[PDB]
Design a protein around this ligand. Structure first.
Ligand SMILES: [Mg+2]
Ligand SMILES: [Mg+2]
Ligand SMILES: [Mg+2]
Ligand SMILES: [Mg+2]
Ligand SMILES: [Mg+2]
Ligand SMILES: [Mg+2]
Ligand SMILES: [Mg+2]
Ligand SMILES: [Mg+2]
Ligand SMILES: [Mg+2]
Ligand SMILES: [Mg+2]
Ligand SMILES: [Mg+2]
Ligand SMILES: [Mg+2]
Ligand SMILES: [Mg+2]
Ligand SMILES: [Zn+2]
Lengths: 136, 177, 60, 115, 84
RNA sequence: CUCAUAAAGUGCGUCGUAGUCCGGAUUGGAGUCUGCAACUCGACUCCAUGAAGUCGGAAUCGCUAGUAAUCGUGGAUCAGAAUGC
RNA sequence: UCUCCUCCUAAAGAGUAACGGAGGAGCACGAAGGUUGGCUAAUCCUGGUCGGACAUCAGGAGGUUAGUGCAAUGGCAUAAG
């Protein structure tokens, strides 16, 4: 479960998630799972997808996680009246814009990479596609 | 003045022949000699720092600067601005006379003397050595001492490299081992 | 040089038992009698086995 | 005044002043004074400079101070590097010449170390 | 120690084995029970297995190290320390 | 006949209260004797070094006269090896 | 919690709310004020008696990563240090 070791501040504003993403190319490995929809990726979701990939490939090849959940999300408990302070931090998300290469993989044939990325795309909450490294 | 005249008449010629220089200004000079005493037990007895100042003054023939702490240190329980050492800087005539006193008298009086390390250059040609017992200087009489002390000596030189610095000191016949 | 704060620094004579006489300005005041100098120290001048001792003690 | 790199006592007699050297005892001090032709009850303060010079010559004939210290250290290190029984005893800091270690042995074993 | 006039002591069987080893080169270690024999200059560079009570300890005889005893060289008491 | 000069004492000089000219443990080197052989594991000699120790907590012991204290000597055992008897 | 200061929210002038997110103040100083003259930091590496990861000394690298009587912001080399 990914989380920053320390941050300057514990709570952040909600903010907005407009625009299209940077880091949209396959940079290190040969194949990539790229997000086409827009949303948030919980650290639990990222972990579940990574576990599914690594188990599908059986620990050959190399896997890069190109996103990191650095934004804390708060929640209020039940039976708490609205308005008495910002709530407590519960989990961390990574905001995703379209075209954002979430995961990336090398050292494995294309069909096995496609199958592993299919299992992880089934674990993720947003729309994805499979992309290949292109020379320029 | 004796070793300074010795410098001017033969050491510059020796270094010219040795290193194929083009300028007598390029031939290295001995710039200064700095003597320092770390008297860090002044925090317990400040008066002993005054004793060490009188000691260094008698050795070098010059009143010393009482050096204080640059910044406060946790382990040694010193505060910034607190006097913990003393230092003299020797330039010119007094530097040459003290250098002669050292290399002729005080160095042969060292207990268990087998020579000075040739690795004691700071990478730039400057030399540093330590004196364990100030009693090696004859200016300090024996039965008037209260505590055995030491000091350290830094010959700062305008030479560019270790080979040049050790060549200069060897041309002055500095007892390297 | 500042006045009145520096120690008295006048020229004296140091004699070493190897017959050496030298003159230096120093702060001790009186003349100096030296046990050794740079001209008679063995390091400066240049004055500084089991099978052998076995053969010497048990020569046959 | 200064013999073999240390300052000998001045108000004591000649034999004690010469045995203050590391490496000179009573017998060697008597040998030094006999070879220098100097009475043993004459103090260093009433000894002249030339007599002190002859004493320096005789002490330099003997082997004292740093030479003796480094010979002893070299021999002990030679044993401990060699690995004989005496070398092992010197390594563990125990009595070497076959003394008992069940009791006593306190000079080599230092102060008592309770459990 | 031994008197100078009596010279250094060495067992005859050990001396003969050393002489044979010298004249026919470096073989396997010289097995011996003579802790009482002193090392001579002639067995320099040789492996001697000295009996110490239950096993034969190998000793590699060299130059700086002659004149002592193989008994000094082979310890007899095994000691690792109390409270272990 | 040998072991086998008893020592404390006595007289003279030095030391002048200091870890010392007290103390003699430890250690390095060089040896002698005995014994087939001194490494584990002997004694003594010489040289070199000079550790703790400056009168000892609670407690505890011996002694009523040639005794306590203090200083030397011999024997048995034994080739050699006593601060024990 | 209630007065005062600093940042953000605050939408590139000002101002701007919530039991919104973070920190401070209720002083100090006759020098820590005035002026004239002078000077430049943090940290690391190398060498050096006790001295050690760290004291004082010498040289280099570095270039304000320091400093500011006390928070934070904005300033500061002509130094405001
Ligand atoms: Mg003796
Ligand atoms: Mg014994
Ligand atoms: Mg003591
Ligand atoms: Mg006393
Ligand atoms: Mg008795
Ligand atoms: Mg008898
Ligand atoms: Mg007997
Ligand atoms: Mg505005
Ligand atoms: Mg606006
Ligand atoms: Mg309004
Ligand atoms: Mg101010
Ligand atoms: Mg100004
Ligand atoms: Mg100002
Ligand atoms: Zn001389």
């Amino acid at each position: 479960m990914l989380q920053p070791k320390r941050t300057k501040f514990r709570k952040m504003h909600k903010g907005r998630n407009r625009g299209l993403a940077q880091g949209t190319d396959v940079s290190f490995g040969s194949f990539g799972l790229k997000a086409v929809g827009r949303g948030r990726l919980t650290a639990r979701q990222i972990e579940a997808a990574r576990r599914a990939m690594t188990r599908a490939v059986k620990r050959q090849g190399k896997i890069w996680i190109r996103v990191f959940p650095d934004k804390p999300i708060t929640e209020k408990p039940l039976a708490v009246r609205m308005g008495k302070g910002k709530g407590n931090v519960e989990y961390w998300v990574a905001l995703i814009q379209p075209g954002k290469v979430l995961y990336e993989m090398d050292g494995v044939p294309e069909e096995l990479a496609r199958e592993a990325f299919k299992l992880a795309a089934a674990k993720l909450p947003i729309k994805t596609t499979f992309v290949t490294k292109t020379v320029m | 003045a004796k070793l300074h005249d010795y410098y001017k008449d033969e050491v510059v010629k020796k270094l010219m022949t040795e290193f194929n220089y083009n300028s007598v200004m390029q031939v290295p000079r001995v710039e200064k000699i700095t003597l320092n005493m770390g008297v860090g037990e002044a925090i317990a007895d400040k008066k002993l720092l005054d004793n060490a100042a009188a000691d260094l003054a008698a050795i070098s023939g010059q009143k010393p600067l009482i050096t204080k702490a640059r910044k406060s240190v946790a382990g040694f329980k010193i505060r910034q601005g607190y006097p913990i050492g003393c230092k003299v800087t020797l330039r010119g005539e007094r530097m040459w006379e003290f250098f002669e006193r050292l290399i002729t008298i005080a160095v042969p009086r060292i207990r268990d003397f087998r020579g000075l390390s040739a690795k004691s250059f700071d990478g730039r040609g400057n030399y540093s050595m330590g004196v364990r017992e100030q009693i090696i200087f004859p200016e300090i009489d024996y039965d008037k001492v209260d505590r055995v002390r030491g000091l350290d000596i830094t010959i700062t030189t305008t030479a560019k490299s270790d080979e040049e610095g050790r060549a200069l000191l060897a041309a002055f016949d500095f007892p390297f081992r | 040089m500042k006045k009145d704060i520096h120690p008295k620094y006048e020229e004296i004579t140091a004699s070493c038992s190897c017959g050496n006489v030298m003159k230096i300005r120093s702060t001790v005041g009186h003349d100096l009698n030296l046990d050794v100098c740079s001209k008679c120290h063995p390091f400066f001048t240049g004055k500084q086995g089991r099978v052998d001792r076995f053969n010497k003690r048990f020569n046959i | 005044a200064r013999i073999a790199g240390i300052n000998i006592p001045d108000h004591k007699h000649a034999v004690i002043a010469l045995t203050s050297i590391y490496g000179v005892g009573k017998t060697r001090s008597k040998a030094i004074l006999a070879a220098a032709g100097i009475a043993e009850d004459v103090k260093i303060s009433e000894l002249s400079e030339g007599q002190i010079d002859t004493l320096r010559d005789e002490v330099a004939k003997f082997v004292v101070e740093g030479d003796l210290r480094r010979e002893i250290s070299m021999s002990i290190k030679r044993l401990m590097d060699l690995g004989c029984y005496r070398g092992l005893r010197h390594r563990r800091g125990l009595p070497v010449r076959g003394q008992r270690t069940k009791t006593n042995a306190r000079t080599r074993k230092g102060p008592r170390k309770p459990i | 120690p031994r008197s100078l006039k009596k010279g250094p002591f060495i067992d005859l069987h050990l001396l003969k084995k050393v002489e044979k080893a010298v004249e026919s080169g470096d073989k396997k270690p010289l097995r011996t029970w003579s802790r009482r024999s002193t090392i001579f200059p002639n067995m320099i560079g040789l492996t001697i297995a000295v009996h110490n009570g239950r096993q034969h300890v190998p000793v590699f005889v060299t130059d700086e190290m002659v004149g002592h005893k193989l008994g000094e060289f082979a310890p007899t008491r095994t000691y690792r320390g109390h409270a272990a």
